[PDB]
Amino acid sequence: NQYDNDVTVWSPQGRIHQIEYAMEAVKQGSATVGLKSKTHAVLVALKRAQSELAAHQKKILHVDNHIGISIAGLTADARLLCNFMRQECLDSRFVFDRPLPVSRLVSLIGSKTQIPTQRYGRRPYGVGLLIAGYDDMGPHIFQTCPSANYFDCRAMSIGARSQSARTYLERHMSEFMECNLNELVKHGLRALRETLPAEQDLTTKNVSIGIVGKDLEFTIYDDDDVSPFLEGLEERPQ
């Protein structure tokens, strides 16, 4: 095909297949889970292992005490956007000394990721992100795509095998809004279990959680926090 040069090439079909390949690179990532209540925002991650003598790749990165992120893609661009959001949060704390609202930051990332999509010389940032953030205007759970677009989701899941999760969150969204933090994290864990293969099960080693709240700063909930929340998980019947 002639039409697979840089994103500058418009397809006759009205597409730019580089962008679609970027979405596929998003689907190249592992399963992720993101869900909020009316008072908290929680994202749940599945840390992919490498071997019995190596550690799992981390999926949840800290940007600010009020905004958290979860990645799915080529980790290079993921970390580059992570540093970007860290810098913008710092400038927001510097100028007027105010925690940056989620929406404006996400719009800035959208513009930044869009500039490559028009301009030759740089591939668009090809990583899928889940964003958890709370501000003085509202609680937010967000996702973004390398197409330089972002979507505010009550409940969201990206990666391989994610459709079973997506069905779980679509069925249960009649429940979360006023669920407590423990119930919300249990819902997230149940959503993760849906994507699991029949031969693999959740444990502290491969599960990562991230929670932010109006009265709870964003922190990354790894093995230590995974240990108590594992109880109450839905079983695996047939």
Binding site: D4, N5, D6, H17, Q18, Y21, A22, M23, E24, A25, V26, K27, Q28, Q50, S51, E52, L53, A54, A55, Q57, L74, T75, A76, D77, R79, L80, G121, R122, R123, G126
Partner: protein, 228 residues
């Protein structure tokens, strides 16, 4: 779909840096193990000519006394990464007056690794093993031209890395003493590379929490020679 890094492959991958991963295969194997007693790194030489100075191959190099480093790839990009690591650690000490923790070294090195197609080049065909004993105890990490890094209890990278890694997985566990881990790595290397091991064709390095200096081994491999 191979002209440059800044083009996405149909599956979402990149068929330019995946070959940079393939460049790791043509490099010599190296072994790295993290143990509670200490961190050890092993490097294969395959003596190329008796006239060479054996230490002239920089596949075993130190960036600071509390930390270790090992290489598998093109020695030029290897030396570039080595120099960058020494520079970041020395500057971190200059500004903070403390040792640069090994995880921060691995992260900060990777930003230079993240310049193949995002500034304004090409990924360096080198894969590295870091071993540090610091504020988080004994540590061993692995990093690859793709820019991803991982804390490792053990790791083997380079040519014939797959079989060595498999055997090490069968033997190693995350609660060994250091000496038996070195012995396992040594027998695996002896199995794989050429022949009966000696200082000419293998290199060894190991750093300890109580000895945050001198990972290198210089003719104390004689104990290894008489033992293994």
């Amino acid at each position: 779909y191979d002209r440059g890094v800044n083009t996405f492959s149909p599956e979402g991958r990149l068929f330019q840096v995946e070959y940079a991963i393939e460049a790791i295969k043509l490099g010599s194997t190296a072994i790295g193990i993290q143990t509670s007693e200490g961190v050890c790194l092993a490097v294969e030489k395959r003596i190329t000519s008796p006239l060479m100075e054996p230490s002239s191959i920089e596949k075993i190099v130190e960036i600071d006394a509390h930390i270790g480093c090992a290489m598998s790839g093109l020695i030029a990009d290897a030396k570039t990464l080595i120099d960058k690591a020494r520079v970041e650690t020395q500057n971190h000490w200059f500004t903070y007056n403390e040792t640069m923790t090994v995880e921060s070294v691995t992260q900060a090195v990777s930003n230079l690794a993240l310049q193949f197609g995002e500034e304004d080049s090409r990924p360096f065909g080198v894969a590295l093993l870091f071993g540090g004993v610091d504020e988080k105890g004994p540590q061993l990490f692995h990093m690859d031209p793709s820019g991803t890094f991982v804390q490792c209890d053990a790791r083997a990278i380079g040519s014939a890395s797959e079989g060595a890694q498999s055997s090490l997985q069968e033997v190693y566990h995350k609660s060994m003493t250091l000496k038996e881990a070195i012995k396992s790595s040594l027998i695996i290397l002896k199995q794989v590379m050429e022949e009966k091991l000696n200082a000419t064709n293998i290199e060894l390095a190991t750093v300890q929490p109580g000895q945050n200096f001198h990972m290198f081994t210089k003719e104390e491999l004689e104990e290894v020679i008489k033992d293994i």
